[PDB]
Structure 1
Amino acid sequence: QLTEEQIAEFKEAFSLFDKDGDGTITTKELGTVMRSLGQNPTEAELQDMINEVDADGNGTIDFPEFLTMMARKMKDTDSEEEIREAFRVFDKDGNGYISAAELRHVMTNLGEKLTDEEVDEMIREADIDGDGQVNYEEFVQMMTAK
């Protein structure tokens, strides 16, 4: 039994890739997201990613195929170097602390804008030690929570 919140989460994830809202993720759009995160896949490499889950053979990724992609490639858990890779995405200035301002920017860059109230809520929930920023240990620890 899927909840509507689960469905909403899948939709948001899908829409991050599907920037033109046409219902399919193309190599261009997959590429755009991975380039926003510092990666440089080739067009062929992006096509290969699509091919793996491209069950109807049309060359692009639709909603159910994207679910399959996440099932396979969100296969459990952030190891260590990948958690650390993610931290680096958010800690833009490399100083070891994610500021509210940093988080807001990175999130806008990905393509999900949220009220500064929301961003501050994210910082505040994760900020265990009280300094108003999120260090690596706190970034790691927020990932365990409900």
Structure 2
Amino acid sequence: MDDIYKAAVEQLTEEQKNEFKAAFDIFVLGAEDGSISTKELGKVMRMLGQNPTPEELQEMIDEVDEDGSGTVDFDEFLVMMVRSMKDDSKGKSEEELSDLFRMWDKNADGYIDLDELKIMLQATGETITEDDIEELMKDGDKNNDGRIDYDEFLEFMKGVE
């Protein structure tokens, strides 16, 4: 707030990078709820004038807030624009199983054999014999190489293990 010209040159520095935020703020700087609405979708082309994907909104319902604000600000929409891709923040993830099968590991060598697969199986069976249980390590095999790791573990059928 000093000299029309001096103000233009004074606002021409690295700070300009962050100023990008105030730019979008022009759309809604005094909303009635003080939150970002669906307008945040068009706000992209409204300024950046780009062709965003419909997937960016798909993840919006799953989880767009990753800064701890409870909402998606103008900038947050630009960074989360890529989050729509294959990310690991949609709630229930396969990562859980990794800690489940690993939590056991009889040999603790990141591997489950006929014995390591039977133990975890018997943990929840139904009047079934062990002879048939061992069949697991025999059946489970996405590559058919007599091996069942984390991938070949959960790949089974989330039932036989």
TM-score in same-fold range (> 0.5): no
The structure where helix makes up a greater share of residues is 1
- Which of the pair has more CA radius of gyration? 2
- For normalisation by structure 2, the TM-score amounts to 0.34
- Which of structures 1 and 2 has the larger relative contact order (alpha carbons within 8 angstroms, sep 6+)? 1
